[PDB]
Amino acid sequence: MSKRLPPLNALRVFDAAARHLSFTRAAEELFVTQAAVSHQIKSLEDFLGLKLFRRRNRSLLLTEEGQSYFLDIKEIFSQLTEATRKLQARSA
DNA sequence: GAGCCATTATAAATTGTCCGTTGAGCTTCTACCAGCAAATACCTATAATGGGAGCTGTCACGGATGCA
């Protein structure tokens, strides 16, 4: 069974969506456009089947459907960036 | 009312493709001395001096053939 992992892009914008509280401001930190955020939520939804946020006026709140899947994203990028540091540091 | 999340299109990116090289290691093909097996030559000095070798066991016409 081929292990269909989540896309390499939807995960990082998902962490900055909660911190920045705004989707437009979530794109300036990742030097991308705001339209790229909505492109990747659907592809990752194929595995989840749960909606990631609940709409609020001029605000972004947390829903339990996507909340379970927040807790298994923020540690992936932490260690891989650490991983980049280790080879780079030992190379020097 | 204006900000911000679903839609639509495209090409830049992006990752898995067709083509080649190569040191090395494994599987053939060849040959050639060793060496033993095999093959081939040569010599033997008491004396020895003419077989048939089993016939063939018989039909029996014709047409020549060669003599006398």
Q: To the nearest 5 percent, what fractions of chain A are helix, strand and coil?
A: 60, 10, 30
A37's CB contacts (< 8 A; 6+ apart) are A13, A17, A23, A26, A27
- Within 7 Å: CB of A25 and strand B? yes
Going by C-alpha positions, the residue among A32, A38, A41 that lies closest to residue A66 is A41
Chain B: nucleotides below 7 Å from protein CB are: 3-9
- Within 7 Å: CB of A24 and strand B? yes
Alpha-carbon distance values, A14 to A22, A67, A88 (Å) = 11, 11, 27
Q: Name all contacts of A5-9 with Cβ < 8 Å and 24+ positions apart.
A: A6/A44, A6/A47, A7/A40, A7/A43, A7/A44, A9/A36, A9/A40
Q: What is the distance in angstroms measured between the alpha-carbon CA of A58 and the sugar C1' of B3? A: 7
Nominal resolution (angstroms): 4.0
Residue owning tokens 């298994």: A72
> Which experimental approach was used here?
cryo-EM
Alpha-carbon distance values, A85 to A11, A68, A76 (Å) = 20, 29, 14
Q: What is the distance in angstroms measured between the alpha-carbon CA of A24 and the sugar C1' of B4? A: 7
Question: What are φ and ψ of residue A61, in 5° steps?
Answer: -115, 170
